[PDB]
Design a protein around this nucleic acid. Structure first.
Ligand code: K
Ligand code: MG
Ligand code: MG
Ligand code: MG
Ligand code: MG
Lengths: 95, 290, 51, 50, 247
RNA sequence: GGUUCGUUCCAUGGAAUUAACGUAAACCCUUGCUUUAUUUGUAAAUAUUAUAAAGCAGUUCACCUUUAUAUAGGAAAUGAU
């Protein structure tokens, strides 16, 4: 339905196996955003390490971490990497 | 002239001699007395046993552990003692664990599960291939490419699949599903040398896949789900275990298919194919309305 | 004499492709890195055997 | 710590919980793996106990 | 009309998780044929007809896989072993399997045209050296040589060139049995002198083709491809660079 | 760890599988050869200089040596070419 006009969720649509509209109902939130730097033969190379958490709000939480020179791609990586790492968390009385 | 002409006669006489020699071999080959042949090297492949006793396991050197110095004290539960400088694995512990794995390989095959027999050693190729034929499973006799389970989307990308019904006969109409479906993963791995390939067993524990392994005295028993304490360095003990597990799968597939003929399916559509069905109805609903 | 050819997709010609992307970036609030991915995503490559 | 966390003995406990509920709240859980019921009554043996 | 209620994806080949599925499937078939037809007699190696088996690259391309050279080396040994079976005793299954490994490659054929001899007995050999092209008309004679109408002395003022022009006839000791009428164009003194060497040699071979082994060691059969290198921008000459100032 | 002009190739590693650019290949000139065309170029001519379109060609074959038997290398005016 045009929800994913970039194609980033297609690769994830196979691992977890659920519609793209259902991937947008998950609660995502960027938690950490580090500005790391690697010294190379061509000078400093600054990257953006981010950690994103994904959960449906009913006992599933996934943690993902990725980095890239672009802050936009680093968040989309962890987002996809966190939705596929979701695991059931036991909760007493769901509270 | 006369020298090379001799070969022409010999090369032309091989068919006649072979036929005559084959016939003569059926006349006087067995006349003296009956030989009590009770062991043939290639007997675990031509006709493996359904169940291994203590005599079979001992004769196959399934109790020879590694040097006492090179041991993992974690698996001190299966050791019987010490002799000839090596640890002797208990023949009873090897049989009880082998009978349990056979019950695991049988049920997984009874529920339509995909088994994988993994033995990667110089001479373990005929054993694994034979076990797979019986259990209708997949074989692997070379270095397991790291990531074939956790990174299956890339490694097993172009490998073809097929959809089969209860009676294992292919179904038509899943052409669009076999292009977006992601590659498969073994529902059960049977490693004949867990000490060698730990990258495979780790992907199974990381992907929640049961495993069966032959734990030698120096192998870490926490690498698999169902251990089989035995000698993995012996080519004669591995062919016996694989035969038992191979026959277990065969006996499991027989029950599954025999039950299908009675309209009793021992398994339900996997989640992956299940989701495709729901989308099919959604797309079909539009045709009904429109 | 004119020989105007009609293109089905705007990716089969670099002249048409570089102008569409340019008009998209002229907006002050244009997301550069995102406008490029939406165009690449529309460029389908044929299945091939890398071997 | 050169070793790795091997959870091969809990593949059932882990798979049984991940298949109990659905990630998409409001829908029934999809069918579990074909091996979840085969080893339902065949737990692993106790390892690492001197 | 709808889909079957029960369905599950199953791999086609049993070698689904191997490095090269399509290859092993064909390799296990050979191992299977080498188990039931192993009792058949063999033929000595010297009596096996030469066969051009496919190379490692051909299998990689037809199978679309990356088969290891070591794993293929052992699969090829089975092909050579199964090929040793006696033809009359060899079954039809092995024959078909062995016909898929034959390499049907034919190298391109480029046969040079032989230099003819005119009705009057004059063969025209062509030789070039770095700027020029000669045309020697060698005939049976007393040993007269005319380079472009003039004699060998009135054309080449340097005896080093006279000996190099008719070196072919000198190494073979036939200066006194052939008459040459050369016609050169372009190049310089040495460029034309050495050009005539390859012309008379080629023309001489038209009369006595058995002299090539001698002209080979005399150096009158090889065409020297050395050529003046072009001038390159930034250089004073082909390679001479201008002065470099560090400061 | 070997080998290669070369992250080339082979083998192997308790983690690898791959994509793009450079590299390589290919391209233009040049070299031998085949076919085509013969003017404004070529003495004649049954076509051989020149002109210029296309195609083929190499480390190919032979000889010697060769590791883990997996990948090869050497010899350079007196093997062929
Ligand atoms: K020409
Ligand atoms: Mg061992
Ligand atoms: Mg100069
Ligand atoms: Mg590698
Ligand atoms: Mg280049």
């Amino acid at each position: 339905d045009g929800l994913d006009d970039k194609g980033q969720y297609q690769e994830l649509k196979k691992r977890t196996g659920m519609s793209v509209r259902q991937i947008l109902q998950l609660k995502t939130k960027k938690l950490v955003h580090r500005r790391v730097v690697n010294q190379t033969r061509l000078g400093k190379i600054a990257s953006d390490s981010v950690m994103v958490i994904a959960g449906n709000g009913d006992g599933w939480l996934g943690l993902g971490m990725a980095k890239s020179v672009e802050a936009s791609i680093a968040v989309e990586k962890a987002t996809l990497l966190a939705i596929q790492n979701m695991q059931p968390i036991p909760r007493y009385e769901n509270r | 002239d006369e020298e090379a002409l001799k070969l022409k006669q010999q090369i032309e006489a091989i068919p006649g001699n072979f036929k005559l020699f084959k016939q003569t071999k059926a006349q006087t080959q067995k006349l003296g007395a009956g030989v009590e042949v009770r062991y043939i090297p290639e007997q675990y492949l031509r006709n493996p046993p359904s169940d291994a006793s203590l005599e079979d396991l001992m004769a196959a050197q399934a109790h020879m552990g590694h040097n006492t110095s090179l041991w993992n004290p974690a698996n001190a539960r299966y050791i019987y003692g010490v002799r000839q400088g090596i640890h002797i694995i208990s023949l009873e512990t090897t049989a009880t664990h082998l009978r349990r794995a056979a019950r695991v390989v049988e049920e997984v095959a009874y529920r339509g599960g995909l088994i994988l027999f993994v033995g990667t050693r110089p001479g373990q190729r005929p054993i694994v291939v034979r076990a797979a034929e019986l259990a209708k499973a997949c074989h692997l006799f070379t270095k397991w490419r790291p990531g074939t389970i956790t990174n299956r989307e890339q490694l097993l990308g172009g490998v073809p699949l097929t959809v089969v019904d209860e009676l294992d006969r292919p179904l038509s109409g899943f052409e669009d599903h076999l292009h977006d479906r992601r590659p498969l993963a073994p529902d059960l791995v049977v490693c004949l040398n867990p000490k060698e390939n730990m990258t495979l067993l780790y992907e199974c524990s990381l992907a929640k896949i049961p495993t069966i392994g032959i734990i030698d005295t120096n192998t870490n028993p926490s690498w698999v789900t169902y251990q089989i304490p035995a000698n993995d360095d012996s080519l004669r003990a591995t062919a016996l275990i694989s035969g038992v597990l191979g026959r277990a799968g065969e006996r499991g597939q027989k029950r599954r298919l025999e039950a299908a003929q009675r309209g009793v399916v021992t398994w339900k559509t996997p989640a992956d194919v299940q989701g495709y069905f729901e989308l099919a109805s959604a797309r079909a609903a539009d045709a009904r309305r429109r | 004499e004119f020989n105007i050819v009609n293109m089905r997709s705007f990716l089969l010609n670099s002249d048409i492709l570089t102008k569409i992307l340019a008009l998209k970036l002229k907006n002050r609030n244009a997301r550069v890195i995102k406008i490029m991915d939406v165009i690449l995503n529309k460029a389908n490559l044929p299945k091939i055997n890398r071997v | 710590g050169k070793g790795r966390i091997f959870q091969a003995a809990k593949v059932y406990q882990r798979a049984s919980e991940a298949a109990a509920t659905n990630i998409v709240s409001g829908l029934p859980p999809r069918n579990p793996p074909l091996w979840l019921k085969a080893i339902e009554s065949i737990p692993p043996a106790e390892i690492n106990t001197r | 009309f709808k889909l079957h209620p029960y369905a599950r994806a199953v791999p086609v080949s049993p070698s689904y998780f191997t490095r090269t599925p399509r290859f092993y499937d064909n390799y296990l078939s050979l191992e299977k044929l080498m188990e039931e037809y192993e009792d058949l007699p063999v033929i000595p190696a010297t009596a096996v007809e030469r066969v051009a088996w496919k190379t490692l690259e051909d299998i990689r391309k037809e199978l679309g896989e990356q088969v290891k050279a070591s794993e293929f080396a052992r699969c090829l040994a089975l092909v050579k072993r199964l090929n040793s079976i006696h033809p009359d005793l060899k079954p039809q299954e092995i024959k078909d399997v062995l016909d898929s490994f034959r390499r049907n490659v034919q190298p391109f054929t480029n046969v040079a045209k032989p230099i003819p001899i005119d009705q009057f007995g004059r063969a025209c050999g062509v030789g070039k050296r770095k700027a020029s092209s000669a045309r020697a008309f060698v005939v049976e004679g007393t040993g007269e040589v005319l380079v472009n109408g003039k004699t060998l002395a009135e054309y080449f003022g340097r005896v080093h060139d006279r000996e190099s022009a008719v070196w072919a006839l000198r190494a073979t000791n036939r200066i006194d049995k052939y008459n040459v009428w050369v016609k050169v164009e372009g190049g310089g003194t040495t460029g034309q002198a050495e050009a005539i060497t390859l012309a008379i040699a080629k023309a001489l071979l038209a009369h006595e083709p058995a002299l090539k082994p001698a002209l080979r060691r005399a150096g009158c059969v090889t065409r020297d491809p050395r050529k003046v290198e072009r001038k390159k921008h930034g250089h004073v000459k082909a390679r001479k660079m201008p002065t470099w100032v560090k400061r």
